Structures are given as C-alpha cells and as structure tokens.
Ligand binder design. Structure first.
Ligand code: HEM
Ligand SMILES: CC[C@H]1OC(=O)[C@H](C)[C@@H](OC(=O)c2ccccc2CN(C)C)[C@@H](C)C[C@@H](C)C(=O)/C=C/[C@H]1C
Length: 396
C-alpha cells in the first residue's frame, strides 16, 4: 500500500490506536508508516509475529545495522545493553543480572513499602479528597526507588521529570537533544563523584567494575549503563501504575472483585500489563538482511517496531481481548518483551506496582476516577502509552 500517516489521524488515534492496529493486522504482519514525530518506520502487528520478531536474531538492536543516523548527543549514550547484540549484550547484562533477581529485589520490599506509605499519607492530607495520581504517586515512587538504588542525591532528582518529559513529549526536536546533553553531563559528574568514595550503591559498584578492567566495562558503557537503568525503568513503571489504576477504576466490576479478594492482586497487575501496559511498541530493531514477512520484504537497515499493544489484542491468543479481566490467563504477554532482552527490571516493576495498587485500594475508601475517560489525555507517541494526568478522589 502507500505509507500511512499516523500524525494525520486524530488525537483519537492517540486516545485509542487499537482499531488502526487491528485493521493493519487483518491486511498482514508488516506495514510502513510515518510517526506523528515524522519518522518512516515499519510496524509489526499480530501476536505470533510479534513474539517471533522479538526473539529473531536477524533483527539487530545495534545501531551499526541501521541506516538511520544518530546525533552526537544520542551517540554518546548508545553504549547500553538494550541497544546491543551478542556478544556485547551478553557481557553487559552479566554485570547487573545478580542485582535484579527476584530474591534480591525482594530485599527492597520494606523500603519500597515505606516510600509508598509516605507518598499516600501525603496524598490523603489533601483537604477536598482529590489528587492527581501522577504527581502524588505514579511519578515519585519509581524515581525515588531507582534513585536510592543508584545513588542519585535527593536535590538532583527533579531534573529527571524534565529530561524524560522531553524524550517522550518534547516541545521540539532541539530540546530533546539539549535534555540528552544535559543528562549525559550530569551522569558523568555523578559517576566521577562516586570514584574513590567506597560507596555501596549500584553506581559506585559499577564505577569500581569499570576502573578494575576497562575491557569489561568501558567508561562510555559505564555512562550508558547508568543512563539505561534510569530511563528504562522509570518512564515505564510510572505509566504502568497510572494506566493500571486507570483500567481498574474505569472497570468498577473488576475493582470490586479485587477489594473483595486481595489474593487477586498479582493477577490484576499482570492484566494491567496485558491490557494497557506502558510499552505500546518495542524499541527499535534493524534487520541485518532483507527479511520476508508473508511476502512483505523489509529491507536491511530499516527501523522496525513490534507493536506489543496489538499482540495483546490478538483474539486467537487472548480471548475476548477488549475485556479487562484480572483473572485472565496472562502468561505470554509481551509487556516485558521476549527473548534475550526480556526486561531485567520486571521483578522490581512488579514489586512497586503491586505495593502501590494495594496501598491505594486499602487506604482510599470509595476511591474513584475524578473525570470522565473521554476527558483524559494520552501522549500521542506510538511507543509509549501514557496519560498527561490522572485525577482521582476518595471519601473525606
Ligand atoms: C512497568 C515496568 C516495565 C516495563 C513494562 C518494562 C518493559 C521493558 C521492555 C518491553 C523491554 C524490552 C524492550 C525491547 O526488547 O525492545 C525492557 C528491557 C529493559 N528494561 Fe524494562 N520495563 C519495565 C521496568 C524496568 C525497570 C524498573 C528497569 C530497571 C530498573 C528496567 C530496565 C530494563 C532494561 C535495562 C532493559 C534492557 C535489557 C536487555 O537489553 O537485555 N525496566 N523493559
Ligand atoms: C522499555 C525500554 C525503554 O526504552 C528506552 O530506554 C529507549 C532505548 C530510549 O532509546 C534511546 O535512547 C534512543 C532512541 C531512539 C534514537 C536514539 C536513541 C539514543 N540511544 C541510542 C542512546 C528512548 C526511546 C527513551 C524514551 C522514549 C523512554 O522513556 C522509553 C522508555 C522505554 C520504552
């Protein structure tokens, strides 16, 4: 067909892109499109095709295989595991795998609970029983966790809402590059601040690993690792919490069910990921050779987006897919990807989301959405499903 312009679809396409994705899926697996930002890319839609492409080594994540150029500021930060293939990817992920196991992340539970308690206390102080859930919770909890973990001092953390705000929804191209340069310069000064201080946080550890053996972790990869750990876990966990609570509060049958039986909570969190998880499309992939998908040939070097949102509405794989149902069999969702890059952070994402959902339900009586769904505004980006705000209210 021709290329399909997505920016030239309404705020409607941002508010509910799923029917567009479903229509493409009925035509085939791979489609050339143009993003609202302006970029010519491929979409891959359909569960079985998504799953497969995420795990197919012909699809590289190394920008050396892309025909798309990076700016200087972007180049300085691509020395990370998510934008690598084996063997670099293998080497890099070994350095932090131990820190993100289920058993190790469980040790954080008391602290995370303590962070959520304080954030909810503060919220419930509001005199008119209303708040924005983003400002009060979905946003502060994950920065706070990832910031203690890596050793970002308190005063420096606000900057991150601004820097990542510009990576998602900039005012223009040039401010994304400025944020990037600004963030890179800050992570170097932070990294240097750790050297020689004998600190026991994750970033001090990495500084020591790099200093001990530059071939295991170069100083560009050291920066890249700090960068990826911050970003990758933060834009995503924020919007999971926010979207997830939005799904629950816009499906009051399901909210009631979970109140009545809080053993259902983990299952609910998984269905929050399946139904409206923050990663709408996976991160860029570039074919190392022409790749044929039901007779559509995607050329070597092109940018390919696996549309996870659409794999999640594929009825052959998720029955009655438009239904939000916290008891559903969710095993096999691709919210955390699939394959060698499967999310390193998932045990932490889950731990925070489970604790936040439960605190809200247990401490807010008659908790409720404080606008209509049609009033909410979603960020247009086809890679990130997220709200501008989430007005709620409760009794008192
Ligand atoms: C709701 C929470 C989260 C979601 C939905 C999410 C999603 C994902 C997805 C889909 C990928 C794979 C992307 C691809 O293959 O293109 C990924 C990779 C990754 N995530 Fe997450 N993530 C979340 C939380 C976190 C957290 C909390 C961290 C870090 C603390 C984190 C760190 C990473 C890293 C480092 C990778 C790259 C791993 C690799 O290349 O081997 N994520 N995540
Ligand atoms: C689940 C993984 C997260 O994705 C990322 O961290 C990717 C790799 C990051 O990508 C880039 O850094 C990027 C993306 C496109 C072009 C150039 C670059 C520069 N890079 C080579 C250092 C960009 C897309 C960050 C934004 C959109 C975000 O908050 C994403 C949050 C999640 C979706």
């Amino acid at each position: 067909p021709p290329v399909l312009d997505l920016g030239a679809l309404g705020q409607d396409f941002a508010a509910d892109p799923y029917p567009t994705y479903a229509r493409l899926r009925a035509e085939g697996p791979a489609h050339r499109v143009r993003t609202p930002e302006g970029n010519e890319v491929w979409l891959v839609v359909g569960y079985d095709r998504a799953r497969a492409v995420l795990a197919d080594p012909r699809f590289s994540k190394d920008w050396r295989n892309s025909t798309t150029p990076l700016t200087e500021a972007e180049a300085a930060l691509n020395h990370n595991m998510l934008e690598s293939d084996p063997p670099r990817h293998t080497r890099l992920r070994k350095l932090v795998a131990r820190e993100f196991t289920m058993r190790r992340v469980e040790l954080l539970r008391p602290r995370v609970q303590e962070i959520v308690d304080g954030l909810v206390d503060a919220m419930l102080a509001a005199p008119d029983g209303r708040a924005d859930l983003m400002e009060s919770l979905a946003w502060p909890l994950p920065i706070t966790v990832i910031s203690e973990l890596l050793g970002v001092p308190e005063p420096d953390r606000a900057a991150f809402r601004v820097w990542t705000d510009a990576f998602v929804f900039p005012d223009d191209p040039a401010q994304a590059q400025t944020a990037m340069a600004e963030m890179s310069g800050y992570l170097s000064r932070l990294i240097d601040s750790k050297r020689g201080q004998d600190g026991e946080d994750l970033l001090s550890a990495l500084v020591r690993t790099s200093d001990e053996d530059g071939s295991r972790l170069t100083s560009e990869e050291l920066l890249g690792m700090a960068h990826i750990l911050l970003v990758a876990g933060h834009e995503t966990t924020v919007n999971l919490i926010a979207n997830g609570m939005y799904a629950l509060l816009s499906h009051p049958d399901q909210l009631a069910a979970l109140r009545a039986d809080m053993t259902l909570l983990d299952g609910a969190v998984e269905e929050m990921l399946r139904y409206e998880g923050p990663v709408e499309s996976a991160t860029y992939r570039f074919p190392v050779e022409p790749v044929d998908l039901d007779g559509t040939v995607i050329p070597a070097g092109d940018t390919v987006l696996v549309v996870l949102a659409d794999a999640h509405r594929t009825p052959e794989r998720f029955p009655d897919p438009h239904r939000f149902d916290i008891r559903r069999d969710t095993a096999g969702h691709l919210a955390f990807g699939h394959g060698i890059h499967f999310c390193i952070g998932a045990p932490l994402a889950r731990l925070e989301a489970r604790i936040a959902v439960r605190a809200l339900l247990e401490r807010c009586p008659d908790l409720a959405l404080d606008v209509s769904p049609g009033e909410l505004v979603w960020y247009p980006n086809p890679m990130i499903r997220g709200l501008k705000a989430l007005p709620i209210r409760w009794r008192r």
